[PDB]
């Protein structure tokens, strides 16, 4: 076929195609069942003010393309223009009085220290088995710590969120640090680089400069445990600026 | 929060709804006791 | 002279070996049965090596090959060809691009050309660096293949500039260059004298012009030939005055995709085996120490492949086909047992292809690898919405920002004012209740004549009638007024163009941002159909498009007699087959609807086959529509499971019963106030403000005026075959757009077109 | 006790006074009168282990 | 002996890229390979065996016992998935000199099981959209083995028949380990196991609910579904082509287990029977007990005893 004539045919063909589209039914079944099957479309983009055709495509795949999509390991992306602009344009968005320590703060610090993670990377509304990688030795090691720290635990504590599990301890717990947290703060000052000044001399600096009594003193030390520096810092003067940022 | 998160989007919504409905019955006893 | 390598049989063995060496675990390179094994684009170096590396060997290119530095390696899949299958026999063809003497040493650029069954498949581009001090200017040259440059000729000055250029040799001197599109396929030979001054500039190649018939023809030669020159005049001319075929468009903000840790192996032995890069400086310590290196280094080409595997993973979603062009700059060298930290950024688009830019650092936070990756969009289908959903100021947020949007609306709006004497924008933004068109002045007259010439065809008791729209409008008319109850925006001769504009506008923004694949398939629901064609194949101008869509709305408004006020005896209703009964299917509606129209005699038919067993639309007689919603109200309240007693209990006593069930709803709905208010019930939902049974057989009559109007606004030299073929899916013939006999036949079987049948009768116009 | 959490509380009472006998009268939701929402089986299967750690607990079953 | 088995076997060196000089990897931690490639099955399987044998040694030596004495005090022995081979090897040991010939077999077994199963079904790269989704749905890193806590065998079997109905033959999943009464492991393609995890997230409760005021038979189930950090589907129909090639690679490496050499009962991991009471080759059964046949652990730990010794890896995470 010569492209001069090929042109002429297509022109004529399309002309009656539109003329007679007008007065003959929309066979949108066989439309859908061509680009979904005969082309294996990985991404449909509905250009329109409402996701009408998105819905029509979405529910066609729900009905008869369950067995077919899984059989090809074919991931499908359904997008409308109006709703799903950001995926199509590729422009996502960036996204002083003394008080005994809370169980909610102490719980967060014991979990954050064991996971080697920061004091804000852990959200409180999350179960213990969730924010662990299912390691389980890490899981029961945390539960082993909470047994030492608070004493009596609820039943399956690793299935109730830290936010929910905080108030349960808060009732029977009051101020006094105890076994596990003291031993971790025993390491924090000893293993790191308050080289000259021990626990007692570190306590008096918070009480003198900032004006924090015993209850407030412990809470600042727990934040320092979650923000453990781990680099061999030199003198007292750097270690004073460490306790300043933690306060 | 779990209402307002899912309301933005119907299974596992009525189960949040009668959970906060039940807490209002217990809370109605508390301030009556107060 | 050209270097050719041995034809290379790809084996299931050699790919499997190569993947484990580099650590590419992508699904496409694993022997799953049925779905053959692919070979990576990295694997080309294994094929290419024997030819490519030969380029640096001759006596005239004299270098200490110990102090060679692998600078950059680039792959480029030619457009259209599929990547390497397991069964492929691959011919290699290595051409050297550039030998150049710089102060610090000599740069060698090599261009491999892999061949499958005689077709080019991909270009392998390697740059190599001999360190030292070379006065080798005689054996120093630059034979490049410049990319294709295209010029749009618009003005009488663009032509006059080209006529001033000696190297613009035409075959026909008189040839008309006005409003044409020249494409320049250019290569250029250069020989040197100094590090800066060229001894011989030679630039040539054919000059093709874009024809209306989609294929180009060569009627022009570039013939530049100089002596002692400084730069290539011809290329710099085409940079500024023309443009490339493909335009890169940066995002507003680059997106960090991922930051990943790929590690170098303990030894370079396993890569050396599969690659054929047995270079001793990678493997033997004493050789390494002789080259003044900090020990046995990891292969350049290992690092390239390793990073590419993550690019393939994290940007192409575990698919080998999508990655189109990968280049890799080697900044510094890499030791075994090192921890490479590669950051991946999606930075830009080029006509529906993503630009990936990556950056790999070691432990010491030193730049090691940079490069670019052209990656395809997934397989894409654009589907354009139909009527129904239209609010005040729809897509006006997009009009304010996008330059491309501003183009679409305004150019249309300028036509609406200059031809039909209103602002379509005014309509969208304000949604007025009454609009008055005035025909005063010479310009007013032309608009009035444009309202006159509108026609339609309805069957009036006897025969056809070529009655015109707007009976009020004559040669003595001064005003015509458009009247609505709520606003003109919901009166369908305004709804339709606005909807069409919004969608087209949206598209052209995406096209301007280069978010449109070349190989995208497209269709549109009823109206969107038109927008789709204007969008993806430039079938009509914006000018010619909105004209038709406007005329469509007009012919739809009048085809039904609606005497009383804005109230006809026709309408349409949306049905949910699932709501009435869990067994009620397609094949249940095709009985009920066909029977209600055969029994009553009143026309009712299915017009929208949208969602299977969830969303269908029936249009026709409002009396016949009140029956169907009541018959479907009856089967939902009985809930007498249809598959149990369809043919299993009462064989064709359904026809007796369905009638009995019809004739107590049929003879109940015939005694209603004449233009009957329709209500909703349990499955059938009425489409509000829809008064016309469009897509029914009723309006087969008024096509000859609609066709003849399409013929004026769709010119033959505005229809690209290539940009429609197996991409366009109409609504009439839900099969890919193909120009073949079986397609023409399938249309006429539904249509009854005399212009179509006169083509099938002599399909022997293969001979011009 | 009605719930898993209530069994726990009983246990902690038995820990406090290990010499004093405690009748642990378990009742599921199936019993007559003021009843819980708990299956008879599920909580006992969970808690039996920790119950029988304390000898002074005398475990009694009811409800139906 | 493994460095030996690299050159002895046809195509091992390309699978074993980074060598197996584990001496240098431990004595100098800087030369140690990555933590992504050690977890690959041809190098993981035998090294885990080594650890189990090592725990047996550090037991026996501190007692002053010869291994022949330590096995004699055992009434019985068995092994979870690949520990079963190392269990039978403990039944064979007699003295410190005739210990290393059992060490040579536990390796041969594990080694070829590791290699040939990597050949039969190697794990592939996952789409990151599936990967990212599973991470924030708190399921593990997608892998061919999926652990289901807190469901009856019945309850799991319902939720696999739903998934397997929509799958063709060569991609179906199956219950592979029955660890506890309510502790199951399903194996199959990681792609397919994601599709199973879709169905699971439907019927599961958000963890911060407090179901305390819902009737029990209307409560949503509160269970843990997550992938296992492995690189191969063990006890799956996917690995049946490996089965034939491993028995053939025991014959050429002069390794078989005989009923008379083993002096304690070793418990079959599917029957719970004694392996000593077979007519055919013991090695051929031990392969099928790992590669094809599932593991009903409950019926395996059927024996009555007072004390059980978990030498197995993990410690607190251990089988014990």
UniProtKB/Swiss-Prot annotation, chain A:
Assembly behavior: [Alpha(6)beta(6)] hexamers of two multifunctional subunits (alpha and beta).
Domain Carrier as annotated: residue spans: 101-176
Anything else known: Present with 17000 molecules/cell in log phase SD medium.
Function per UniProt: Fatty acid synthetase catalyzes the formation of long-chain fatty acids from acetyl-CoA, malonyl-CoA and NADPH. The alpha subunit contains domains for: acyl carrier protein, 3-oxoacyl-[acyl-carrier-protein] reductase, and 3-oxoacyl-[acyl-carrier-protein] synthase. This subunit coordinates the binding of the six beta subunits to the enzyme complex.
Family indicated by similarity: Belongs to the thiolase-like superfamily. Fungal fatty acid synthetase subunit alpha family.
Source organism, top-level taxon: Eukaryota
Cross-link (Glycyl lysine isopeptide (Lys-Gly) (interchain with G-Cter in ubiquitin)): 37
Post-translational modification: 4'-phosphopantetheine is transferred from CoA to a specific serine of the Acyl carrier domain by the C-terminal PPT domain. This modification is essential for activity because fatty acids are bound in thioester linkage to the sulfhydryl of the prosthetic group.
Modified residues (Phosphoserine): 50
Modified residues (O-(pantetheine 4'-phosphoryl)serine): 136
Name of the protein this chain belongs to: Fatty acid synthase subunit alpha
Organism: Saccharomyces cerevisiae (strain ATCC 204508 / S288c) (Baker's yeast)
Swiss-Prot record, chain B:
Induction description: Expression is increased in absence of RPN14 and upon treatment with tunicamycin, an agent which causes accumulation of misfolded proteins in the endoplasmic reticulum.
Disruption phenotype: Decreases cell fitness. Causes severe growth defects and an overload of polyubiquitinated conjugates when associated with a RPT6 thermosensitive proteasome mutant.
Record-annotated disulphide pairs: none
Recorded superkingdom: Eukaryota
Additional free-text comment from the UniProt record: Present with 2110 molecules/cell in log phase SD medium.
Subunit description: Interacts with RPT6. Interacts with the 40S and 60S ribosomal subunits.
Name of the protein described by the UniProt record: Translation machinery-associated protein 17
Underlying gene: TMA17
Residue span relative to the full protein: 51 to 100 of 150
Curated annotation (Swiss-Prot), chain E:
Active site per the UniProt annotation: 81 (for acetyltransferase activity)
Top-level taxon of origin: Eukaryota
Disulfide pattern: none
Similarity comment: Belongs to the fungal fatty acid synthetase subunit beta family.
Additional free-text comment from the UniProt record: Present with 91800 molecules/cell in log phase SD medium.
Assembly: [Alpha(6)beta(6)] hexamers of two multifunctional subunits (alpha and beta).
Entry function: Fatty acid synthetase catalyzes the formation of long-chain fatty acids from acetyl-CoA, malonyl-CoA and NADPH. The beta subunit contains domains for: [acyl-carrier-protein] acetyltransferase and malonyltransferase, S-acyl fatty acid synthase thioesterase, enoyl-[acyl-carrier-protein] reductase, and 3-hydroxypalmitoyl-[acyl-carrier-protein] dehydratase.
Protein's UniProt name: Fatty acid synthase subunit beta
């Amino acid at each position: 076929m010569k492209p001069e004539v090929e042109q002429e045919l297509a022109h004529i063909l399309l002309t009656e195609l539109l003329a007679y589209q007008f007065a003959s039914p929309v066979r949108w079944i066989e439309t859908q069942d061509v680009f979904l099957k005969d082309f294996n479309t990985e991404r449909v983009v509905e250009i329109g003010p409402s996701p009408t055709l998105a819905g029509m495509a979405q529910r066609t795949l729900k009905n008869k393309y369950e067995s077919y999509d899984a059989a090809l390991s074919l991931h499908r992306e359904i997008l409308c223009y109006s709703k799903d602009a950001k995926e199509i344009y590729y422009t996502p968005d960036p996204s002083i009085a003394d008080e005994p320590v809370k169980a909610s703060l102490l719980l967060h610090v014991l979990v954050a220290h064991k996971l080697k993670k920061s004091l804000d990377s852990i959200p409180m509304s999350k179960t213990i088995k969730d924010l662990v990688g299912g390691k389980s030795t890490v899981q029961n090691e945390i539960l082993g710590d909470l047994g030492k720290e608070f004493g009596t635990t609820p039943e399956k504590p690793e299935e109730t969120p830290l936010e929910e599990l905080a108030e349960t301890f808060q009732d029977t717990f009051s101020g006094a640090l105890g076994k596990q947290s003291s031993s971790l703060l025993s390491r924090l000052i000893s293993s790191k680089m308050p080289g000259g000044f021990t626990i007692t001399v570190a306590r008096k600096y918070l009480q003198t400069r900032w004006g924090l009594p015993s209850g407030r003193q412990d809470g600042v030390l727990l934040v320092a445990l979650s923000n453990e520096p781990a680099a061999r810092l030199g003198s007292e003067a750097d270690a004073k600026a460490f306790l300043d940022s933690m306060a | 929060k779990y209402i307002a998160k899912l309301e933005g989007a119907s299974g596992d919504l009525a189960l949040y709804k009668d959970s906060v409905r039940e807490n209002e019955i217990v809370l109605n006893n508390y301030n009556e006791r107060v | 002279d050209v270097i050719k390598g041995k034809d290379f049989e790809i084996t299931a063995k050699e790919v499997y070996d190569f993947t484990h060496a580099v650590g590419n675990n992508c699904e496409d390179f694993v022997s799953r049965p049925d779905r053959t094994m692919l070979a990576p684009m990295d694997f080309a170096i294994v094929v290419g090596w024997r030819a490519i590396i030969k380029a640096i060997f001759p006596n005239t290119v004299d270098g200490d090959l110990l102090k060679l530095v692998h600078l950059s390696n680039g792959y480029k899949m030619i457009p259209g060809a599929k990547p390497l299958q397991v069964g492929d026999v691959v011919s290699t063809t290595a051409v050297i691009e550039s030998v150049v003497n710089q102060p610090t040493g000599k740069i060698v650029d090599v261009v491999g050309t892999l061949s499958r069954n005689g077709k080019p498949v991909m270009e392998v581009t390697s740059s190599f660096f001999y360190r030292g001090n070379y006065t080798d200017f005689e054996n120093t040259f630059q034979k490049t293949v410049e990319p294709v440059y295209q010029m749009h000729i618009k003005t009488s000055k663009d032509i006059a500039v080209l006529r001033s250029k000696e190297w613009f040799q035409l075959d026909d001197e008189d040839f008309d260059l006005l409003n044409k599109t020249l494409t320049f396929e250019t290569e250029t030979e250069v020989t040197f004298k100094n590090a800066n001054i060229f001894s011989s500039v030679k630039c040539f190649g054919p000059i093709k012009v874009e024809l209306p018939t989609k294929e180009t023809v060569e009627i022009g030669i570039v013939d530049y030939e100089a002596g002692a020159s400084h730069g290539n005049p011809v290329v710099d001319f085409l940079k500024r005055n023309g443009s490339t075929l493909e335009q890169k468009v940066n995002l507003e903000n680059p997106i960090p995709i991922a930051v990943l840790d790929s590690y170098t192996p303990s030894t370079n032995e396993p890569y050396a085996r599969v690659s054929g890069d047995l270079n001793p400086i990678h493997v033997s310590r004493h050789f390494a120490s002789y080259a003044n290196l900090p020990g046995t280094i990891t292969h350049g080409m290992f690092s390239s492949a390793s990073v590419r595997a993550l690019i393939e993973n994290w940007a192409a979603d575990s698919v080998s086909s999508r990655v189109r062009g990968y280049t890799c700059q080697f900044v510094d060298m890499v030791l075994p047992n090192t921890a490479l930290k590669t950051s991946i950024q999606h930075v830009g688009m080029i006509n529906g292809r993503k630009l990936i830019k990556f950056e790999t650092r070691n432990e010491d936070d030193v730049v090691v690898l940079t490069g670019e990756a052209e990656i395809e969009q997934p397989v894409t289908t654009f589907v354009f919405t139909g009527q129904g959903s239209q609010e005040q100021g729809m897509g006006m947020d997009l009009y304010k920002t996008s330059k491309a949007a501003q183009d679409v609306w305004n150019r249309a709006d300028n036509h609406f004012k200059d031809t039909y004497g209103f602002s379509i924008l005014d309509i969208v933004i304000n949604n007025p209740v009454n609009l008055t068109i005035h025909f005063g002045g010479e310009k007013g007259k032309r608009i009035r004549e444009n309202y006159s010439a509108m026609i339609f065809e309805t069957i009036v008791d006897g025969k056809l009638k070529t009655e015109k729209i707007f009976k009020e409008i004559n040669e003595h008319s001064t005003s015509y007024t458009f009247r609505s109850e709520k606003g003109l925006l919901s009166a369908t001769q305004f709804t339709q163009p606005a909807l069409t504009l919004m969608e087209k506008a949206a598209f052209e923004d995406l096209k301007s941002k280069g978010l449109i694949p070349a190989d995208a398939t497209f269709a549109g629901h009823s109206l969107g159909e038109y927008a789709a064609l204007a969008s993806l194949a430039d079938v009509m101008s914006i000018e010619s498009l909105v004209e038709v869509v406007f005329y469509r709305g007009m012919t739809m408004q009048v085809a039904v007699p609606r005497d009383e006020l804005g109230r006809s005896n026709y309408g349409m209703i949306a049905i949910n087959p699932g709501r009435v009964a869990a067994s009620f299917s397609q094949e249940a509606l095709q009985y009920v609807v066909e029977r209600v129209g055969k029994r009553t005699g009143w026309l009712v038919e299915i017009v929208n086959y949208n969602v299977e067993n969830q969303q269908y639309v029936a249009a026709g007689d409002l009396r016949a529509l009140d029956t169907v919603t009541n018959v479907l109200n009856f089967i939902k309240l009985q809930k007498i499971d249809i598959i149990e007693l369809q043919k299993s209990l009462s064989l064709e006593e359904v026809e007796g019963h369905l009638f009995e069930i019809i004739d107590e709803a049929s003879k109940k709905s015939a005694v209603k106030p004449r233009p009957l208010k329709l209500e909703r019930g349990f499955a059938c939902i009425p489409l509000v403000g829809i008064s016309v049974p469009f897509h029914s057989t009723y309006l087969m009559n008024g096509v000859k005026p609609f066709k003849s109007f399409l013929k004026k606004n769709i010119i033959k030299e505005n229809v690209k075959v290539a940009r429609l073929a197996g991409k366009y899916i109409p609504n009439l013939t839900a099969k890919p757009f193909q120009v073949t006999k079986e397609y023409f036949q399938d249309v006429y079987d539904l249509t009854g077109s005399e212009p179509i049948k006169e083509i099938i009768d002599n399909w022997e116009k293969y001979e011009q | 006790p009605g719930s898993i959490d209530a069994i726990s509380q009983v246990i902690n009472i038995a820990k406090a006074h290990p010499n004093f006998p405690i009748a642990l009268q378990w009742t599921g939701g199936r019993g007559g009168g003021h009843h819980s929402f708990e299956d008879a089986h599920t909580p006992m299967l969970q808690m039996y282990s920790k119950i029988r750690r304390h000898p002074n607990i005398m475990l009694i079953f009811g409800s139906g | 002996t493994l460095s030996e088995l690299i050159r002895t076997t046809l195509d091992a060196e390309k699978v074993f890229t980074q060598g197996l000089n584990i001496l240098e990897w431990l004595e100098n931690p800087s030369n140690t390979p990555d933590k992504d490639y050690l977890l690959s099955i041809p190098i993981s399987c035998p090294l885990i065996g080594v650890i189990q044998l090592a725990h047996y040694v550090v037991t026996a030596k501190l007692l002053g016992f010869t291994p022949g004495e330590l096995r004699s005090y055992l009434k019985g022995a068995t092994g979870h998935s690949q520990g079963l081979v190392t269990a039978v090897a403990i039944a064979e040991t007699d003295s410190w000199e005739s210990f290393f010939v059992s060490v040579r077999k536990a390796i041969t077994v594990l080694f070829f099981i590791g290699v040939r199963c990597y050949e039969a079904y190697p794990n592939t790269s996952l789409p990151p959209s599936i990967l990212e989704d599973s991470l924030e749905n708190n399921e593990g890193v997608p892998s061919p083995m999926l652990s289901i806590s807190n469901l009856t065998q019945e309850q799991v079997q319902d939720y696999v028949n739903k998934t397997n109905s929509h799958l063709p033959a060569g991609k179906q999943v199956e219950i592979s380990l029955v660890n506890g009464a309510k502790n199951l492991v399903v194996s199959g393609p990681p792609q397919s196991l994601y599709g199973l995890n879709l169905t699971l997230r439907k019927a599961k409760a958000p963890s911060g609910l407090d179901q305390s005021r819902i009737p029990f038979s209307e409560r949503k189930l509160k269970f843990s579904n997550r992938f296992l950090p492995v690189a191969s589907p063990f006890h799956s129909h996917l690995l049946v082509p490996a089965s034939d090639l491993i028995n053939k690679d025991l014959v050429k490496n002069n390794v078989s287990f005989n009923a008379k050499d083993i002096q304690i009962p070793v418990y079959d991991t599917f029957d719970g029977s004694d392996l000593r009471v077979l007519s055919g080759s013991i090695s051929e059964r031990i392969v099928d007990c790992i590669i094809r046949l599932p593991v009903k652990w409950e019926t395996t730990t059927q024996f009555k005893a007072t004390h059980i010794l978990d030498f197995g890896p993990g410690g607190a995470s251990g089988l014990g």
